Design a protein around this nucleic acid. Structure first.
Ligand SMILES: [Mg+2]
Ligand SMILES: [Mg+2]
Ligand SMILES: [Mg+2]
Ligand SMILES: [Mg+2]
Ligand SMILES: [Mg+2]
Ligand SMILES: [Mg+2]
Ligand SMILES: [Mg+2]
Ligand SMILES: [Mg+2]
Ligand SMILES: [Mg+2]
Ligand SMILES: [Mg+2]
Ligand SMILES: [Mg+2]
Ligand SMILES: [Mg+2]
Ligand SMILES: [Mg+2]
Ligand SMILES: [Mg+2]
Ligand SMILES: [Mg+2]
Ligand SMILES: [Mg+2]
Ligand SMILES: [Mg+2]
Ligand SMILES: [Mg+2]
Ligand SMILES: [Mg+2]
Ligand SMILES: [Mg+2]
Ligand SMILES: [Mg+2]
Ligand SMILES: [Mg+2]
Ligand SMILES: [Mg+2]
Ligand SMILES: [Mg+2]
Ligand SMILES: [Mg+2]
Ligand SMILES: [Mg+2]
Ligand SMILES: [Mg+2]
Ligand SMILES: [Mg+2]
Ligand SMILES: [Mg+2]
Ligand SMILES: [Mg+2]
Ligand SMILES: [Mg+2]
Ligand SMILES: [Mg+2]
Ligand SMILES: [Mg+2]
Ligand SMILES: [Mg+2]
Ligand SMILES: [Mg+2]
Ligand SMILES: [Mg+2]
Ligand SMILES: [Mg+2]
Ligand SMILES: [Mg+2]
Ligand SMILES: [Mg+2]
Ligand SMILES: [Mg+2]
Ligand SMILES: [Mg+2]
Ligand SMILES: [Mg+2]
Ligand SMILES: [Mg+2]
Ligand SMILES: [Mg+2]
Ligand SMILES: [Mg+2]
Ligand SMILES: [Mg+2]
Ligand SMILES: [Mg+2]
Ligand SMILES: [Mg+2]
Ligand SMILES: [Mg+2]
Ligand SMILES: [Mg+2]
Ligand SMILES: [Mg+2]
Ligand SMILES: [Mg+2]
Ligand SMILES: [Mg+2]
Ligand SMILES: [Mg+2]
Ligand SMILES: [Mg+2]
Ligand SMILES: [Mg+2]
Ligand SMILES: [Mg+2]
Ligand SMILES: [Mg+2]
Ligand SMILES: [Mg+2]
Ligand SMILES: [Mg+2]
Ligand SMILES: [Mg+2]
Ligand SMILES: [Mg+2]
Ligand SMILES: [Mg+2]
Ligand SMILES: [Mg+2]
Ligand SMILES: [Mg+2]
Ligand SMILES: [Mg+2]
Ligand SMILES: [Mg+2]
Ligand SMILES: [Mg+2]
Ligand SMILES: [Mg+2]
Ligand SMILES: [Mg+2]
Ligand SMILES: [Mg+2]
Ligand SMILES: [Mg+2]
Ligand SMILES: [Mg+2]
Ligand SMILES: [Mg+2]
Ligand SMILES: [Mg+2]
Ligand SMILES: [Mg+2]
Ligand SMILES: [Mg+2]
Ligand SMILES: [Mg+2]
Ligand SMILES: [Mg+2]
Ligand SMILES: [Mg+2]
Ligand SMILES: [Mg+2]
Ligand SMILES: [Mg+2]
Ligand SMILES: [Mg+2]
Ligand SMILES: [Mg+2]
Ligand SMILES: [Mg+2]
Ligand SMILES: [Mg+2]
Ligand SMILES: [Mg+2]
Ligand SMILES: [Mg+2]
Ligand SMILES: [Mg+2]
Ligand SMILES: [Mg+2]
Ligand SMILES: [Mg+2]
Ligand SMILES: [Mg+2]
Ligand SMILES: [Mg+2]
Ligand SMILES: [Mg+2]
Ligand SMILES: [Mg+2]
Ligand SMILES: [Mg+2]
Ligand SMILES: [Mg+2]
Ligand SMILES: [Mg+2]
Ligand SMILES: [Mg+2]
Ligand SMILES: [Mg+2]
Ligand SMILES: [Mg+2]
Ligand SMILES: [Mg+2]
Ligand SMILES: [Mg+2]
Ligand SMILES: [Mg+2]
Ligand SMILES: [Mg+2]
Ligand SMILES: [Mg+2]
Ligand SMILES: [Mg+2]
Ligand SMILES: [Mg+2]
Ligand SMILES: [Mg+2]
Ligand SMILES: [Mg+2]
Ligand SMILES: [Mg+2]
Ligand SMILES: [Mg+2]
Ligand SMILES: [Mg+2]
Ligand SMILES: [Mg+2]
Ligand SMILES: [Mg+2]
Ligand SMILES: [Mg+2]
Ligand SMILES: [Mg+2]
Ligand SMILES: [Mg+2]
Ligand SMILES: [Mg+2]
Ligand SMILES: [Mg+2]
Ligand SMILES: [Mg+2]
Ligand SMILES: [Mg+2]
Ligand SMILES: [Mg+2]
Ligand SMILES: [Mg+2]
Ligand SMILES: [Mg+2]
Ligand SMILES: [Mg+2]
Ligand SMILES: [Mg+2]
Ligand SMILES: [Mg+2]
Ligand SMILES: [Mg+2]
Ligand SMILES: [Mg+2]
Ligand SMILES: [Mg+2]
Ligand SMILES: [Mg+2]
Ligand SMILES: [Mg+2]
Ligand SMILES: [Mg+2]
Ligand SMILES: [Mg+2]
Ligand SMILES: [Mg+2]
Ligand SMILES: [Mg+2]
Ligand SMILES: [Mg+2]
Ligand SMILES: [Mg+2]
Ligand SMILES: [Mg+2]
Ligand SMILES: [Mg+2]
Ligand SMILES: [Mg+2]
Ligand SMILES: [Mg+2]
Ligand SMILES: [Mg+2]
Ligand SMILES: [Mg+2]
Ligand SMILES: [Mg+2]
Ligand SMILES: [Mg+2]
Ligand SMILES: [Mg+2]
Ligand SMILES: [Mg+2]
Ligand SMILES: [Mg+2]
Ligand SMILES: [Mg+2]
Ligand SMILES: [Mg+2]
Ligand SMILES: [Mg+2]
Ligand SMILES: [Mg+2]
Ligand SMILES: [Mg+2]
Ligand SMILES: [Mg+2]
Ligand SMILES: [Mg+2]
Ligand SMILES: [Mg+2]
Ligand SMILES: [Mg+2]
Ligand SMILES: [Mg+2]
Ligand SMILES: [Mg+2]
Ligand SMILES: [Mg+2]
Ligand SMILES: [Mg+2]
Ligand SMILES: [Mg+2]
Ligand SMILES: [Mg+2]
Ligand SMILES: [Mg+2]
Ligand SMILES: [Mg+2]
Ligand SMILES: [Mg+2]
Ligand SMILES: [Mg+2]
Ligand SMILES: [Mg+2]
Ligand SMILES: [Mg+2]
Ligand SMILES: [Mg+2]
Ligand SMILES: [Mg+2]
Ligand SMILES: [Mg+2]
Ligand SMILES: [Mg+2]
Ligand SMILES: [Mg+2]
Ligand SMILES: [Mg+2]
Ligand SMILES: [Mg+2]
Ligand SMILES: [Mg+2]
Ligand SMILES: [Mg+2]
Ligand SMILES: [Mg+2]
Ligand SMILES: [Mg+2]
Ligand SMILES: [Mg+2]
Ligand SMILES: [Mg+2]
Ligand SMILES: [Mg+2]
Ligand SMILES: [Mg+2]
Ligand SMILES: [Mg+2]
Ligand SMILES: [Mg+2]
Ligand SMILES: [Mg+2]
Ligand SMILES: [Mg+2]
Ligand SMILES: [Mg+2]
Ligand SMILES: [Mg+2]
Ligand SMILES: [Mg+2]
Ligand SMILES: [Mg+2]
Ligand SMILES: [Mg+2]
Ligand SMILES: [Mg+2]
Ligand SMILES: [Mg+2]
Ligand SMILES: [Mg+2]
Ligand SMILES: [Mg+2]
Ligand SMILES: [Mg+2]
Ligand SMILES: [Mg+2]
Ligand SMILES: [Mg+2]
Ligand SMILES: [Mg+2]
Ligand SMILES: [Mg+2]
Ligand SMILES: [Mg+2]
Ligand SMILES: [Mg+2]
Ligand SMILES: [Mg+2]
Ligand SMILES: [Mg+2]
Lengths: 47, 272
RNA sequence: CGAUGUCGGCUCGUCGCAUCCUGGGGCUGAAGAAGGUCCCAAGGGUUGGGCUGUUCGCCCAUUAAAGCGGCACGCGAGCUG
RNA sequence: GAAUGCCGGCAUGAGUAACGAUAAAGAGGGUGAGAAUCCCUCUCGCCGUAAGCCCAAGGGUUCCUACGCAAUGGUCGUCAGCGUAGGGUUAGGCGGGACCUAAGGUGAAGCCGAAAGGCGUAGCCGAAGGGCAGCCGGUUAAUAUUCCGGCCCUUCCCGCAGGUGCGAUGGGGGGACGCUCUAGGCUAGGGGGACCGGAGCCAUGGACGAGCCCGGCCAGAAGCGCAGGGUGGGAGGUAGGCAAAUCCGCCUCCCAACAAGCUCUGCGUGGUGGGGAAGCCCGUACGGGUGACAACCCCCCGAAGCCAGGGAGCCAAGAAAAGCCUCUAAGCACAACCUGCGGGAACCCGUACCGCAAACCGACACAGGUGGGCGGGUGCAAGAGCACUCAGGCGCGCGGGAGAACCCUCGCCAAGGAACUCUGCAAGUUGGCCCCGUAACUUCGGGAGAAGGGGUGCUCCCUGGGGUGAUGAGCCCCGGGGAGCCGCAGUGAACAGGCUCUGGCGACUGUUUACCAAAAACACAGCUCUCUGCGAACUCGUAAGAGGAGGUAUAGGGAGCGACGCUUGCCCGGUGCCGGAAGGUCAAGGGGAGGGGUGCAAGCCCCGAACCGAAGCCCCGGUGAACGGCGGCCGUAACUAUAACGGUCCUAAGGUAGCGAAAUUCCUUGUCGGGUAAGUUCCGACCUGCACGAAAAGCGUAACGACCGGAGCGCUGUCUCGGCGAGGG
RNA sequence: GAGCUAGCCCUGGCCAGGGUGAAGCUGGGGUGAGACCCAGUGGAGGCCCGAACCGGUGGGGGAUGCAAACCCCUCGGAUGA
RNA sequence: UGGUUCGUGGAGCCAUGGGGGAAUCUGGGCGGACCACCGCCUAAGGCUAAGUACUCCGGGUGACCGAUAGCGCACCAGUAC
RNA sequence: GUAAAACCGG
RNA sequence: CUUCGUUCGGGACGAAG
RNA sequence: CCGAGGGUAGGGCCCGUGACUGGGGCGAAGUCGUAACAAGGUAGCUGUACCGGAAGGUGCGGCUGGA
RNA sequence: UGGGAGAGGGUGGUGGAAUUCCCGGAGUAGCGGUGAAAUGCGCAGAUACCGGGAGGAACGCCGAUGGCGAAGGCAGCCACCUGGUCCACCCGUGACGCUGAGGCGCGAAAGCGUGGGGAGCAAACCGGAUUAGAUACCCGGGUAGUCCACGCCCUAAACG
């Protein structure tokens, strides 16, 4: 049948991308933890 | 003069459509139309705030003259009578002798090719707009302003009419289509005659889908629900309602008034 | 109760006898025929349907007879549901 | 030494199940150390509205080539979508951006919120939408509407040449639109051909013949030709389009009523450019040459595509902004704008490859899922159905044998046909088209494909309509009649209803528990009650604000019933709601009688009674399509029986109409009647209604239903009662 | 977290092929004028049959599956909610 | 109403949202309801090191661990997945 | 302009 | 339930039980 | 070819019958009320609608077969 | 040709009396009702009185032994539209006439459907009296209906 992951590159960066974190105060605090964790990608990497 | 159908379906057996016989002109005036925001019942937070709405035919808004004191003394010719999808009534083209074109909401026994004019001067004949202090007592009238210079906000559905019952100082006393007796200021404009398309009452939609074409989604009874959702929900095999009958939000729906009691409007109001 | 799947039907049997029939016999209010009752006897057999989920039961048409019970009210790592 | 302990390693099942659609394989020759599995050839099978092409999304090097086989591949592998390396993606015209707006997001002004932040007009962002200028071939191992060839175009910028008052984000026009059905003329596409051009072939009994087989095109500027869309032309007056207009709108006389005329497309022809099969000969896995100076002609079918903003009907009444045209404003009128020509400039990103799938989404080379376009031919009435097959792509990445039980998927059967069983569950009967003929009932539409029948192939002859062609041959689509032939059988294969009678519930189409329930449940038009006069009620939110609604009592919200027919009886005692400026009760507050604590006292500080004190409650009324409720015991009629009648207790009132062993009935398989040989079911009745009953509606109702029950007809492996054969294990 | 799913807003697209033959018009019949009745044209409908598409009715297989919802036969809708 | 040990308690003190609303040394607060006496302070403006907390970092030390331990990571680890 | 009802007899 | 009273008689009504 | 007739399927009319049920008529002298005939004790009658154990009553309009 | 009478029919408008209800003033211990009472209404300020306002229905006097119409039926007034009928003149057509099976149209009241409206009356319903009992007569409330527009129903002591 039709499964959960139906990918869309416009969708992925307008939801999980860097400009969408830096609107919400809850999403700037996402990147602050991922600075502090050490993460090689802060954000889901889209072309 | 309401058209019925032969029963060549189940749903054509009861369906009536209107006669559309006063309609002269079948596509609207392009400078007087502008697009309609469909909403779904959804507000600026995007939450449903009126249930069971959405789905309709696409509509373009018709801009309606609801003042008529823009153009005191400037007469106009009734050019056409048109369908509006955005009200129960019909609308009328006025070609003013300026050459504005405006829509007025179309009264009953207005015919095409007709002088109308707004003013005090403004003789008492159907389509003409006056202050309520200058219309005679006892005449039927519509498009009534409530407070003056604010807009026609009374008696403008199809068939409806207010009737002038008295004067009292600056204020005049109106018999509303609700039956309310009501003190309205005499400087409020008002357009004479009843409205019509008065066979809008006698329309039978025939089927479920003609509700869906007007954007009326299915309406769920709270007896058919669960007690999370409704007071009336629950109960193994069709409860009779449990309780004094009630909204989804808890207030009672048989009899309970909610005119707010200290309204400042309540001393211009005489009846129901 | 860190699980022993429950009624009924189908399939598959097997066992007990306090025996439904067939076999042997005593008594009879056993003339004969057919019966009644009791004793010995399990070797074999103990039909097909209508109703109802039925077990059971009531009928229909036969029969020599249309037996009663046990095996987790036998049998769902065999089936149905 | 245990905690169904945590982590790691290795055993059991066990060389067991399985090796992923039953579309199918066989041989000869190569390479190789190693071939069922890699390459080539021949034969066979499968798809072919795809299992074949072209795009979008997604993926991201998988594309091509060279060298390889440790792991991946459900076996092998010399192969690969795998390992190493190299190469490969070329745009003014294709998509996107230096264009525009939609929902929505953002947001100067402004509003709101303890903070974080929430709104919000203009504006901005925002696209498979609107706008905008490239078609056909050829080359690469891998790119092309991108490179090349030919032929057309688009912007700017600078110059001359010729014209006019030029001139904006500002005004107007336009862009600009629904659903269904459709006429005219084309095109894509397809069929046929005695006509044209081709290597070749007479096979096996006949044929050297209008024989067989293959192919008879594409694009293409100006100009024409054929269809078709948009559109009136002048004159005055003008207060409207938030300044100004010669523009637009409005008013009033004249000229056509017309595409006559202007443009604007589409389609033919068009200077010219290109392509060109089958067979044969070869050297690759891919291709090349020849056939060729290739021919490139004529009829017919014909689009859902094109002219396109066509036409008609209908109600549910069908985006915006920019590009474009026109008009003026300041400013400018040595400027500027327009037309033609010449020269010059034309950026950024993508382009390989898979793309119904082994490269996307499902942990897998996973029988699942994924939007758009093309989708040939013949026959069956049609069709994108079904069967076969062009082009093209495949035999699904374990095989070889055997011929047991047993399972799956089939095929057939004597006699009986439901006796099987919870139930004809399952499977069989029926089945397309043409023509007869068709009941109760009905809301007059239906029921209807009722039911039940007859025909269906082929050959010969006569004959009636159309369409394209001149009214004609031909070619295409429809019929009628007569005569005859063959077979068990003529929709001879494939695709293609079993029917009828009768109840229950729900009017109906529809919706629902993704993943055990599709229903009598939900919804539904329609009925009623109730609220709401607009800054409405109601809803979301602290608020701002927003929906409602740019709606206005024929409207909006809430609740119940659920088309339709006939109807919806009594009780307001308690609860709810509605109406009452009397009265009782009631908090803060006002009020101070009087009393208290300290002072030597003026004073300071405390309690604190009458009385005035709102809503609400008590109280008084009304209201059932508001919450709800709607009896018991005795006696009595010319035989028992029964009780129309009467008496009596209680309640607020004591179930009316209509139905009733019911989807309601315990005793119950109630008692009769009908179907049956036999009927705990079913149908029709009686009423003794444990425990029906009127909008949690009552009783019926045509049509409808993958709902639930009963019965009969047809037909059958369901069964008596099994048997045999087939393929996948 | 609304890339699954539920609803709504904006913008596009899709639904082969057959039947049934509403209203309305045209001619005739009729009337004082009508209502009305015949044909013919017409092409309506939460109409009918049936592919794409959307579903999931009954049965069988599947059950360490091809699949953590599948496959075969069958069936419902298929111009509309 | 909050804070302080103070949960309405005899409830003061310090801040405050709402209402009323003074004075400038003979002025005002406090000493736990209140009053008298006796005393202590000078509100309605602001700034002010040090002594105090922490360890991203650098160093020293350890009756701290020794690759299932020690930080999740001794090894290109917030990585593969 | 009117005037409370007051049954029955094989 | 009973006796009386009104009535032509019964039923109703009236009075004593 | 037609064809007496036999068979299959579906309609129409008529007769007998049927659990149960509606009302009709006559009976033995039964039970309950008093509807109508006299102003029958509310004048009577009638069309219609509703209600009531039942005669009947009421509402609307009509009649003189009454004042 | 020329006049006349009439509640003859349809449409639009319009005048007053009265009932009920709302508001204001004033005013009290009762009002309605019956054969008598009672339900009911009323110190929460009724009936009766005055003034203002709303709404619906029927049109007093004229008015009868009257008129009109085919019948049912028709009654304030005004205007429009319109049928029928009578008289006078004897002018024209010139037997054109009478009746009428079917058909067609009209057809009181009640009743039905759709919407409107609803002051008074009032089936059904609720009480209070009467009675032996009252599903009646009497009284107090009261829903359809009565009114309008459209479409039905087709009846009667539709009788002279
Ligand atoms: Mg928004
Ligand atoms: Mg939001
Ligand atoms: Mg509903
Ligand atoms: Mg539920
Ligand atoms: Mg919830
Ligand atoms: Mg609740
Ligand atoms: Mg229940
Ligand atoms: Mg209950
Ligand atoms: Mg409840
Ligand atoms: Mg247990
Ligand atoms: Mg265990
Ligand atoms: Mg176990
Ligand atoms: Mg023994
Ligand atoms: Mg014996
Ligand atoms: Mg013996
Ligand atoms: Mg003997
Ligand atoms: Mg013996
Ligand atoms: Mg034995
Ligand atoms: Mg034995
Ligand atoms: Mg049977
Ligand atoms: Mg059975
Ligand atoms: Mg048992
Ligand atoms: Mg046994
Ligand atoms: Mg036991
Ligand atoms: Mg057992
Ligand atoms: Mg089992
Ligand atoms: Mg079992
Ligand atoms: Mg076991
Ligand atoms: Mg089952
Ligand atoms: Mg079960
Ligand atoms: Mg231990
Ligand atoms: Mg362990
Ligand atoms: Mg382990
Ligand atoms: Mg092993
Ligand atoms: Mg082996
Ligand atoms: Mg084993
Ligand atoms: Mg084995
Ligand atoms: Mg195996
Ligand atoms: Mg495989
Ligand atoms: Mg070799
Ligand atoms: Mg094939
Ligand atoms: Mg891509
Ligand atoms: Mg991948
Ligand atoms: Mg790679
Ligand atoms: Mg190689
Ligand atoms: Mg390998
Ligand atoms: Mg391998
Ligand atoms: Mg090799
Ligand atoms: Mg490759
Ligand atoms: Mg490679
Ligand atoms: Mg630029
Ligand atoms: Mg831009
Ligand atoms: Mg923009
Ligand atoms: Mg801020
Ligand atoms: Mg915002
Ligand atoms: Mg905005
Ligand atoms: Mg586009
Ligand atoms: Mg382009
Ligand atoms: Mg390629
Ligand atoms: Mg090309
Ligand atoms: Mg080029
Ligand atoms: Mg200009
Ligand atoms: Mg513009
Ligand atoms: Mg415009
Ligand atoms: Mg072509
Ligand atoms: Mg062609
Ligand atoms: Mg040739
Ligand atoms: Mg030969
Ligand atoms: Mg050809
Ligand atoms: Mg003009
Ligand atoms: Mg101007
Ligand atoms: Mg023309
Ligand atoms: Mg050409
Ligand atoms: Mg040309
Ligand atoms: Mg060639
Ligand atoms: Mg058109
Ligand atoms: Mg526009
Ligand atoms: Mg713009
Ligand atoms: Mg311009
Ligand atoms: Mg740049
Ligand atoms: Mg490319
Ligand atoms: Mg490509
Ligand atoms: Mg595709
Ligand atoms: Mg796949
Ligand atoms: Mg995959
Ligand atoms: Mg993969
Ligand atoms: Mg999976
Ligand atoms: Mg993943
Ligand atoms: Mg694999
Ligand atoms: Mg594979
Ligand atoms: Mg698909
Ligand atoms: Mg085709
Ligand atoms: Mg085809
Ligand atoms: Mg064909
Ligand atoms: Mg054929
Ligand atoms: Mg066909
Ligand atoms: Mg096609
Ligand atoms: Mg096919
Ligand atoms: Mg091939
Ligand atoms: Mg057989
Ligand atoms: Mg046979
Ligand atoms: Mg048979
Ligand atoms: Mg049976
Ligand atoms: Mg049996
Ligand atoms: Mg059955
Ligand atoms: Mg079946
Ligand atoms: Mg067959
Ligand atoms: Mg039928
Ligand atoms: Mg028919
Ligand atoms: Mg048939
Ligand atoms: Mg043949
Ligand atoms: Mg022709
Ligand atoms: Mg043609
Ligand atoms: Mg034959
Ligand atoms: Mg078939
Ligand atoms: Mg049935
Ligand atoms: Mg039943
Ligand atoms: Mg249904
Ligand atoms: Mg489910
Ligand atoms: Mg699930
Ligand atoms: Mg279903
Ligand atoms: Mg299901
Ligand atoms: Mg209804
Ligand atoms: Mg709120
Ligand atoms: Mg709005
Ligand atoms: Mg608003
Ligand atoms: Mg409403
Ligand atoms: Mg509503
Ligand atoms: Mg319901
Ligand atoms: Mg009721
Ligand atoms: Mg009550
Ligand atoms: Mg009450
Ligand atoms: Mg009460
Ligand atoms: Mg109240
Ligand atoms: Mg106080
Ligand atoms: Mg106090
Ligand atoms: Mg005080
Ligand atoms: Mg109070
Ligand atoms: Mg007796
Ligand atoms: Mg009684
Ligand atoms: Mg009753
Ligand atoms: Mg029964
Ligand atoms: Mg029986
Ligand atoms: Mg029987
Ligand atoms: Mg029954
Ligand atoms: Mg019964
Ligand atoms: Mg019951
Ligand atoms: Mg019930
Ligand atoms: Mg009940
Ligand atoms: Mg009810
Ligand atoms: Mg119901
Ligand atoms: Mg029923
Ligand atoms: Mg029903
Ligand atoms: Mg009916
Ligand atoms: Mg029915
Ligand atoms: Mg169904
Ligand atoms: Mg359905
Ligand atoms: Mg078998
Ligand atoms: Mg076998
Ligand atoms: Mg075999
Ligand atoms: Mg086999
Ligand atoms: Mg979604
Ligand atoms: Mg069609
Ligand atoms: Mg017709
Ligand atoms: Mg059609
Ligand atoms: Mg349909
Ligand atoms: Mg259907
Ligand atoms: Mg398609
Ligand atoms: Mg799908
Ligand atoms: Mg579903
Ligand atoms: Mg299924
Ligand atoms: Mg299954
Ligand atoms: Mg079907
Ligand atoms: Mg269908
Ligand atoms: Mg505290
Ligand atoms: Mg405190
Ligand atoms: Mg304290
Ligand atoms: Mg405490
Ligand atoms: Mg304060
Ligand atoms: Mg303060
Ligand atoms: Mg001083
Ligand atoms: Mg203090
Ligand atoms: Mg102190
Ligand atoms: Mg103190
Ligand atoms: Mg102290
Ligand atoms: Mg101090
Ligand atoms: Mg200071
Ligand atoms: Mg500190
Ligand atoms: Mg350190
Ligand atoms: Mg170690
Ligand atoms: Mg470690
Ligand atoms: Mg009496
Ligand atoms: Mg009979
Ligand atoms: Mg008697
Ligand atoms: Mg009498
Ligand atoms: Mg009488
Ligand atoms: Mg009488
Ligand atoms: Mg009565
Ligand atoms: Mg009368
Ligand atoms: Mg004469
Ligand atoms: Mg009548
Ligand atoms: Mg009437
Ligand atoms: Mg009526
Ligand atoms: Mg209605
Ligand atoms: Mg009254
Ligand atoms: Mg008594
Ligand atoms: Mg009365
Ligand atoms: Mg008379």
């Amino acid at each position: 049948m039709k499964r959960t992951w139906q990918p869309n590159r416009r969708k992925r960066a307008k939801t999980h991308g860097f400009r969408a974190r830096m609107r919400t105060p809850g999403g700037r605090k996402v990147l602050k933890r991922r600075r502090q964790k050490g993460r090689w990608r802060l954000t889901p990497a889209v072309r | 003069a309401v058209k019925k159908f032969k029963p060549y379906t189940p749903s054509r057996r009861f369906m009536t459509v209107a006669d559309f016989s006063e309609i002269t002109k079948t596509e609207p005036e392009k400078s007087l139309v502008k697009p309609l925001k469909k909403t779904g019942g959804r507000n600026n937070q995007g939450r449903i705030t009126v249930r069971f709405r959405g789905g309709g035919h696409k509509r373009l808004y018709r801009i309606i003259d609801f003042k008529r004191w823009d153009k005191v003394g400037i007469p106009a010719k009734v050019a056409a009578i048109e369908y509006d999808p955005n009200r129960s009534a019909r609308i009328a083209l006025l070609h003013y002798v300026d050459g504005e074109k405006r829509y007025i909401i179309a009264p009953d026994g207005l015919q095409v090719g007709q002088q109308v004019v707004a003013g005090p001067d403004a003789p008492i004949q159907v389509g003409n707009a006056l202050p309520l202090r200058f219309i005679p007592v006892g005449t039927v009238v519509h498009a009534v302003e409530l407070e003056p210079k604010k807009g026609a906000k009374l008696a403008r559905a199809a068939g409806t009419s207010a009737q002038i019952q008295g004067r009292e100082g600056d204020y005049v006393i109106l018999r509303l289509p609700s039956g309310e007796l009501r003190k309205v200021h005499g400087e409020c404009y008002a357009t004479v005659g009843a409205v019509g398309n008065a066979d809008h009452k006698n329309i039978v939609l025939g089927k479920a889908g003609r509700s869906r074409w007007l954007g009326r989604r299915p309406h769920v009874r709270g007896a058919a629900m669960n007690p999370v959702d409704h007071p009336h929900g629950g109960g193994e095999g069709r409860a009779p309602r449990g309780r004094p009958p009630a909204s989804p939000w808890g207030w009672q729906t048989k009899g309970l008034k909610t005119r707010k009691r200290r309204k400042p409007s309540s001393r211009f109001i005489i009846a129901r």
